[PDB]
Design a protein around this ligand. Structure first.
Ligand SMILES: [Cl-]
Ligand SMILES: [Cl-]
Ligand code: NI
Length: 79
């Protein structure tokens, strides 16, 4: 919920990266449905931390839809 340095949170973060990059942009609710419903609070915590760092952004309110940022995609893809 805070333990961003744990193996467990690194695994949730890569599952989020994998989904947002290879599947699509997503609500947090849909990420939990795909990654594991019992991990919703850690998914929310990782998204908030990635947002603070400019690696994802949220779009809209009901619910917000999470997207990879251009800064993050530039580390992953060619222009
Ligand atoms: Cl990542
Ligand atoms: Cl990836
Ligand atoms: Ni934590």
């Amino acid at each position: 919920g805070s333990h961003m340095a744990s193996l467990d949170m690194a695994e949730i973060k890569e599952k989020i990266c994998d989904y947002l990059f290879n599947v699509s942009d997503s609500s947090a609710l849909n990420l939990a449905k795909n990654i594991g419903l019992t991990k919703a609070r850690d998914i929310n915590a990782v998204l908030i931390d990635m947002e603070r760092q400019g690696d994802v952004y949220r779009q809209g309110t009901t619910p917000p839809i999470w997207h990879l940022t251009d800064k993050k995609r530039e580390r992953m893809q060619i222009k």
